[PDB]
Amino acid sequence: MQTAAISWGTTPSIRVYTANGNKITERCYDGSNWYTGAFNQAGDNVSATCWLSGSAVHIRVYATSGGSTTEWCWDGDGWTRGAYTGL
Amino acid sequence: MQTAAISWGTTPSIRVYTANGNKITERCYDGSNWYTGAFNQAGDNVSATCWLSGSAVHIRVYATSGGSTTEWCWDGDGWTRGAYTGL
Amino acid sequence: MQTAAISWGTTPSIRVYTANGNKITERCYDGSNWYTGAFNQAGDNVSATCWLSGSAVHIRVYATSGGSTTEWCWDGDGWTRGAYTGL
Numbered sequence A, B, C: 001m002q003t004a005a006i007s008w009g010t011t012p013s014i015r016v017y018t019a020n021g022n023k024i025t026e027r028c029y030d031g032s033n034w035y036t037g038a039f040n041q042a043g044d045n046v047s048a049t050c051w052l053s054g055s056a057v058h059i060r061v062y063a064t065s066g067g068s069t070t071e072w073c074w075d076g077d078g079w080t081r082g083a084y085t086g087l
Ligand SMILES: C[C@@H]1O[C@@H](O)[C@@H](O)[C@H](O)[C@@H]1O
Pocket: A015, A026, A028, A036, A037, A038, A039, A057, A074
């Protein structure tokens, strides 16, 4: 099992992405109890990074399934496929 | 063997966590030489995130051993278990 | 295959390091297209972190091959081997 961890803002919020059994899932902290996030994509490996637009977060998750990495983007309303490509 | 890397401030301070077998250890830089960190917990995989509130550093390390992830927290006065649970 | 992701700024800039087949390579975004970076070193595992000194980015990439981790540094004028050791 493999994880990635990010955080932002004043609280801060934290997100932890976990890859296990070719599934990546997301656990979330926003100042209170941890909960399960909306992120669900395939992969055996995961990295993530984020930045702020004021108080709004932008997240990029790099989900590797085998020999291919797909970027997934959170920009405030849902996860979308990003433009990232590898070599 | 696997690592996670974090940094903060302008110097900067850097921490590098290494999972080797089922042990995670920590190497530190605060502007002079690399030194040995106090973090020692179990895991075959590690991720980490950090932030400064003013001058106060806060670190969260996600230590995964098999299918279980434990959060360890540094907030200026020792490492303690965080509330994180996985799926 | 395994990745590490960093970002900085508000645009943002993003770098994704991919360890694939005992090599680590880099893909880059600074606001328009993804392009291939100059980073290329051995490794089966990778982590990275970065900071800004004024407007100048500094990156550290921790490349692990087997039981050895090597630090690679970007400070505005090529990648250089860093002083990091695990012990
Ligand atoms: C920042 C967002 O926070 C919650 O809405 C999660 O359900 C999303 O997946 C994302 O992490």
